[PDB]
């Protein structure tokens, strides 16, 4: 019946089961062998492919049965093409559409895909202008260097009429080592023979890859069908300089700038400023929703004095100096050092290891092991020293803790206030947007699978771009190659190496006689499209991360900042080993006195300003020693800014209930 399988479909676990199945099927797709069609692994994965198709066909029928848009068409398209299986190369390439249907199964993935499409749509005015200008520059380059990039194999024949036969080549320029070679009237790989070639060459130039080679090839461009001349027309470099400045420096930075502007405008699509402004939406919220910090002042003065010795600025400075010396000694190791130098460095390593293993126990004794894990940075030193005391024994696997002991530098040197906060907020932004990274990973996966299917059979030669370290033979190697292209190292050289006329590795299955078949004309489209898509997605991720922290990037510390709130919390915890929620009022005088003038009171004596303002400003009518953490902060932030007269205090609470987020039944006391 129609309503029978509806409950099964809408279950809280069926969707996750099908998502796990599609993810693991994609993983199975990413584990085949491009080289050998007949292999043990391929057959094993071949049996698996039958299982998912049976499951996915079952899913389609039941889903259709209860439902009897274009997302469902894609779901059937992926399963449909598989059933035709079981030219075949085109179908095998097309079966890469398996993880593309996971977009509909996740709300976040669908949302980020729609956001990417919307960003693409608004951009198109800039793309059209850039494409038109690049086409005009290609036409000018065609008019300039039409056929002038030809050259002979030996730099002695200047026309094809005499660039024929054999010639003697001198290896490495030595006259005593000659070798006979054939001379061929060759053409440049990136020329300006026609409009399309000019467009491709100018694209490779605009990617800032191999552009000096093209520049110095065009400088030597002499005539229509003659060889190059050394520094013939250096003045022709103006064409390349102007093209680069106009397109890559100017119209590609307008691209990113307009993306940033659009994201900023999208970030201002809501109007919650009924009376307040943005500056009040980042500090009043913190004051309303907060939590007291813990200091853990100990007892048992026999331990308290030891803790005070441990918890002091000179001790921290001494540890800083000791770690700086340790790293300075770590950096002095060089190649083929003297025996005395190595022995002295080893001895100093033992000395520093002993110092650190003493200091851990010294901190634990005065800090107790239970509270050791409370602080994030305290646990960092906890797990390093045992590694130090292990390698001192294994010295006379080994390099693990040898490498891991360097982390102390960043651990004890990130204790700043502008770099630590920057790193933390950017990591928080990265965690807040884990779906653009998923989009990038999906693009990398799809293109790596396509490259494995297409260029996987190209033989690896030590004198080419497709070598033992750069190839499409395995998925990790394909991903590494795509990462190399994304960084833009030699992607045009790889494209040239993936051209149709390439040798095939012996382990592949091909008919005897046709050794040079692997490689396709699809390489140009593959590499250009991958570069464009990867660049677009990378700048999309960058601008998303940037827009996620726009409040910090435009903090304007000259008026206010969360560091004031952090200092207030630290002062609150100074007399409070634990939160405890509420405190007395006798120490509130010192608490107010221990604030900076921008947040607390001016440098003048509190006998005039603070004393009068304490009674003048509205305070909860509690006992003489019962004041809570959620009231004094709001009172102080109201004193510093957003001051309202008595009687009309409920206006602020009405605005809070109308603008600020859910009160969670906590502002009842804050109203008074």
């Amino acid at each position: 019946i129609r309503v029978g399988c509806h409950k099964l479909i809408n279950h809280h676990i069926f969707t996750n089961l099908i998502l796990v199945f599609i993810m693991l099927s994609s993983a199975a797709l990413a584990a085949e062998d491009p080289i050998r069609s007949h292999s043990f692994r391929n057959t094993i994965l071949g049996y698996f492919d039958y299982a998912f198709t049976a499951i996915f066909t079952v899913e389609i029928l039941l889903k259709m049965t209860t439902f009897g848009n274009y997302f469902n068409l894609l779901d059937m398209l992926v399963v449909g093409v598989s059933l035709v299986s079981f030219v075949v190369k085109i179908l095998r390439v097309l079966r890469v559409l398996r993880p593309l249907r996971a977009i509909n199964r996740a709300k976040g993935l669908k949302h980020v895909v729609q956001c990417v499409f919307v960003a693409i749509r608004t951009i198109g005015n800039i793309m059209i202008v850039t494409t038109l200008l690049q086409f005009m520059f290609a036409c000018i380059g065609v008019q300039l260097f039409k056929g002038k990039f030809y050259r002979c194999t030996d730099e002695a024949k200047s026309n094809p009429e005499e660039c024929r036969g054999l010639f003697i080549l001198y290896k490495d320029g030595d006259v005593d080592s000659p070798v006979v070679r054939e001379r061929i009237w060759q053409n440049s790989d990136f020329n300006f023979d026609n409009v399309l070639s000019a467009m491709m060459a100018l694209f490779t130039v605009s990617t800032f890859e191999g552009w000096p080679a093209l520049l110095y090839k065009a400088i030597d461009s002499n005539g229509e069908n003659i060889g190059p001349i050394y520094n013939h027309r250096v003045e022709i470099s103006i064409f390349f300089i102007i093209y680069i400045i106009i397109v890559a420096f100017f119209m590609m930075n307008i691209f990113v700038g307009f993306v940033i502007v659009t994201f900023q405008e999208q970030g201002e699509k809501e109007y919650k400023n009924c009376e307040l402004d943005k500056n009040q939406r980042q500090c009043v919220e913190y004051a309303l929703k907060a939590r007291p910090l813990r200091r853990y002042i100990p007892k048992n003065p026999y331990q308290y004095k030891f803790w005070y010795v441990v918890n002091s600025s000179p001790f921290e400075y001494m540890m800083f100096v000791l770690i700086m010396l340790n790293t300075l000694c770590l950096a002095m190791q060089h190649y083929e050092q003297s025996k005395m130098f190595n022995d002295a460095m080893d001895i100093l390593n033992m000395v520093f290891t002993g110092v650190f293993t003493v200091e851990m126990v010294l901190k634990v004794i005065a800090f107790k092991p239970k509270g050791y894990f409370s602080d994030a940075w305290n646990t960092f030193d906890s797990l390093i020293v045992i590694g130090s005391i292990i390698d001192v024994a294994l010295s006379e696997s080994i390099t693990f803790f040898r490498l891991f002991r360097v982390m102390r530098l960043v651990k004890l040197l990130s204790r700043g206030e502008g770099i630590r906060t920057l790193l933390w907020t950017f990591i928080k932004s990265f965690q807040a947007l884990p779906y653009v990274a998923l989009l990038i990973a999906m693009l990398f996966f799809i293109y790596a699978v396509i490259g494995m299917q297409m260029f996987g059979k190209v033989a690896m030669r030590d004198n080419n771009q497709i070598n033992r370290n750069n190839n499409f033979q395995t998925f990790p190697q394909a991903v590494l190659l795509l990462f190399r292209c994304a960084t833009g190292e030699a992607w045009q050289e790889i494209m040239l190496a993936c051209l149709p006329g390439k040798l095939c590795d012996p382990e592949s299955d091909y008919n005897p006689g046709e050794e040079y078949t692997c490689g396709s004309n699809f390489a140009i489209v593959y590499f250009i499209s991958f570069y464009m898509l990867c660049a677009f997605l990378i700048i999309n991720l960058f601008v998303a991360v940037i827009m996620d922290n726009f409040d910090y990037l435009t903090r304007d510390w000259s008026i206010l900042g969360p560091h004031h709130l952090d200092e207030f919390k630290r002062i609150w915890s100074e007399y409070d080993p634990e939160a405890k929620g509420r405190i007395k009022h006798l120490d509130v005088v010192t608490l107010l006195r221990r604030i900076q003038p921008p947040l607390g009171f001016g440098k003048l004596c509190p006998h005039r300003v603070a004393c009068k303002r304490l009674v003048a400003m509205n305070m909860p009518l509690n006992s003489d020693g019962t004041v809570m953490f959620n009231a004094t902060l709001f009172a102080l932030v109201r004193t510093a800014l957003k001051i309202k007269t008595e009687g009309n205090l409920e206006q602020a609470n009405e605005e809070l209930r109308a603008v600020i987020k859910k009160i969670w039944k906590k502002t009842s006391m804050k109203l008074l």
Partner: protein, 555 residues
């Protein structure tokens, strides 16, 4: 001092420019060679130094201003160099005269203020610079611990000191990496290194330099592959891929995020004064003029057909035909294709001339030159008719044929002018031309200064290889300028750095201290490049959207 107000500053500026051009026309020859032009330029420099010391002595009758301190320093340095040469390393101190173009900004408050703004913009980036330095130090230390003394085993020959590869790569340090495959080759220790010893992890300086190079995205895969040859495939990829992601991609986002925030922080500061209001006020009267000009004249002073949509589509098909005619040329094209190209050129020139003449007799001559579109079309058509008459006249014009095609290629503007949606950006960038010129001139001055410094340092010293000729050199001014531009683009800057290091003695000796020339030229060059081409794209582009929103309010 009474008369020195207008002419003294102008004369000093002219003297600075003349000194700059005299430095530009100097040719550094290798191995103490020279010619007559250098001999004359020596006396020219003598006269310029005399003028400069006279001005320095006169200006006292001073030190508080930094620019005057710089002028005094360079003047006394020139005096020191001249005295040493006359009474005598000798020409090594000659590199301090490259600061003469630098003081030109003092005389140019515009350039100066721009320079002050750019310098003050660097304060928020110091924390990012410190983070980059710490990451570089940590990665260099890790490389010292891991990859120390491993790039020293290349495929050699049987009982000989000859490398068996034209492009050698390291062997396996402990039988895990790459092994010789040739029948009569074995590999042992004693090798120099991959890049002549420059790129390796067997010293703190070497490790720091190669880590910085890998962070700059240039040539990191070469180091990764050399590691893959030395050791296995599993350890090195973790070190370098993570370094690439954290070293630059994370840092590039952090650098852009701060500057984009800082630039947007200037937008909120400049909005209080009302700079955007002036642009809106100037723009809001432009549409009020077009509707009040045609109507105020057409009542008394035929034209319906020319403004019809049929005429628009006809001119569009004509420009499409012209574009197809231009973009159909290729190497070894058929002769009949050439014949069709000339026939189409003549026919379309005649048709466009007839269309222009028809428009001139039904729209008005005065209304044309008011708009920038009509005058450009007049220039294009005059250039085209001149091209045709010159081609078919008694003048061959061999080189001018290609130039004139680019003149007639610009007809696509006639159909891109009807956008009206992207024109906000065009108007804003055309109205900010003074600022655009100021930043472009500052960038050009930076490039010129560093080109002259590179000419002084590596001029003629790239003749050490003896087996090949190098194209990215500092031989003359155009070549040094091209090399500086290429380094600014960031492509193959490490190759130029390697050449400069090998020109001063290679990895051994104190010849590696010169590598800080390329580090400064890259870091301090990309920083300005990222402030000049991003300010235009953030200031005049944010205003365009604000202008669009304001225009939408009235629409």
């Amino acid at each position: 001092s009474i008369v020195e107000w207008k002419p003294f500053d102008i004369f000093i500026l002219l003297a600075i420019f003349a000194n700059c051009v005299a430095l530009a026309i100097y040719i550094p020859f290798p191995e103490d060679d020279s010619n007559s032009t250098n001999h004359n330029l020596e006396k020219v420099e003598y006269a310029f130094l005399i003028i400069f010391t006279v001005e320095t002595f006169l200006k006292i009758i001073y030190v508080r201003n930094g620019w005057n301190l710089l002028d005094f320093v360079i003047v006394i340095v020139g005096l020191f160099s001249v005295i040493l040469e006359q009474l005598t390393d000798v020409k090594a101190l000659r590199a301090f005269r490259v600061l003469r173009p630098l003081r030109l900004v003092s005389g140019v408050p515009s350039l100066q203020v721009v320079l002050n703004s750019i310098i003050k913009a660097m304060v928020p980036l110091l924390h990012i610079a410190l983070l980059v330095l710490f990451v570089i130090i940590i990665y260099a230390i890790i490389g010292l611990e891991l990859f120390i003394g491993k790039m020293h085993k290349t495929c050699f020959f049987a009982d000989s000191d000859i490398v068996a590869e034209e492009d050698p790569a390291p062997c396996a340090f402990s039988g895990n990496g790459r092994q010789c495959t040739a029948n009569g080759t074995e590999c042992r220790s004693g090798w120099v290194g991959p890049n002549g010893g420059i790129t390796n992890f067997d010293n703190f300086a070497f490790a720091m330099l190669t880590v910085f190079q890998c962070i700059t995205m240039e040539g990191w895969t070469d180091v990764l592959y050399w590691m893959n040859d030395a050791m296995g495939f599993e350890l090195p990829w973790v070190y370098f891929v993570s370094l690439v992601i954290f070293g630059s991609f994370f840092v590039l986002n952090l650098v852009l995020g701060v500057l984009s925030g800082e630039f947007s922080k200037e937008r909120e500061k400049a909005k209080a004064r009302g700079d955007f209001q002036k642009l809106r006020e100037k723009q809001q009267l432009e549409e009020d003029l077009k509707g009040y000009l045609d109507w105020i004249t057409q009542a008394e002073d035929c034209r319906a057909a020319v403004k019809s949509v049929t005429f628009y589509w006809l001119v569009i098909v004509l420009v499409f035909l012209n574009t197809l005619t231009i973009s159909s040329e290729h190497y070894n094209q058929p002769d009949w294709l050439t014949q069709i190209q000339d026939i189409a050129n003549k026919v379309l020139l005649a048709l466009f001339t007839c269309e222009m003449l028809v428009k001139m007799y039904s729209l008005g001559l005065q209304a044309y030159f008011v708009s920038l579109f009509n005058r450009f079309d007049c220039f294009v058509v005059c250039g085209g008719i001149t091209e045709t008459i010159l081609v078919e006249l008694e003048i061959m014009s061999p080189l001018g044929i290609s130039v004139f095609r680019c003149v007639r290629l610009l007809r696509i503007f006639k159909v891109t002018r009807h956008w009206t949606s992207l024109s906000n950006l065009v108007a804003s960038l055309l109205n900010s031309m003074k600022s655009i010129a100021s930043l472009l001139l500052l960038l050009f001055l930076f490039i010129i200064i560093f080109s002259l410094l590179g000419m002084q340092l590596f001029g003629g010293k790239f003749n050490f290889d003896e087996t090949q000729t190098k194209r990215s050199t500092f031989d003359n001014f155009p070549q040094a300028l091209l090399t500086v531009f290429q380094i600014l683009t960031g492509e193959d800057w490490n190759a130029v750095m390697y050449d400069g290091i090998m020109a001063y003695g290679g990895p051994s000796s104190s010849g590696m201290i010169v590598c800080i020339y390329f580090i400064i030229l890259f870091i301090c060059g990309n920083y300005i490049l990222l402030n000049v081409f991003l300010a235009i794209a953030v200031d005049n582009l944010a205003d365009a959207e604000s202008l669009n929103t304001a225009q939408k309010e009235e629409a």
